[PDB]
Amino acid sequence: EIDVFCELSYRQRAMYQSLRNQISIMDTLMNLVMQFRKVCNHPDLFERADTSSPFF
DNA sequence: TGGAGAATCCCGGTGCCGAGGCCGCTCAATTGGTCGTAGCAAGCTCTAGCACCGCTTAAACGCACGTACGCGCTGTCCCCCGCGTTTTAACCGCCAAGGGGATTACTCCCTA
């Protein structure tokens, strides 16, 4: 059994920390631990990156 | 009237498939007892439904009389039927999708 640690990429931690900011109001925690598990898997699960352009 | 042909009947054969009957279970109908009530029986009031009389007039009705409208009769046509050809898409089969819902998993926190 080999443990393989890797840190949250800058996009993931932008998701994770703004999500964790909800703990300043709630604590829904069982909802948050599923959103935290999504971003810990891939942020496209939480918000799919897609072709984008400036504000019109 | 006759006739030909096209349309409908009837008779027998075939098949399939659904109705009628059988079997398990269950759960919902029945037995037995309690308790509340509700509506059934008496009694009182007096409300308004019925009957009658007399007057008023305005609504009904019998009949005169016309003319306005119902209907049969003629002509036209046009437009809907009937039947043959062309075309389309309804019906059937088979696979696909997914989409919804109920069960199961596991944390977190309310509430008893």
DSSP conformational letter for A48: -
Q: Which ranges in A1-56 belong to alpha helices (H)?
A: 10-20, 29-39, 43-46
Distance A23 CA to B68 C1' (A): 96
Give the resolution to one decimal, in Å.
2.8
Give every CB contact of residue A34 below 8 A, 6+ residues apart in sequence: none
Q: Which of residues 1-56 of A touch strand B (CB under 7 A)?
A: 27, 29-30, 33
Technique behind this structure? cryo-EM
Judge contact between A46 and A15, C-beta under 8 A: yes
CA distance A20 to A26: 10
Give every CB contact of residue A9 below 8 A, 6+ residues apart in sequence: A43
Residue at A39: amino acid letter? V
The dihedral of CA A42, A44, A50, A52: what is its sign?
Answer: negative
Judge contact between A27 and A47, C-beta under 8 A: no
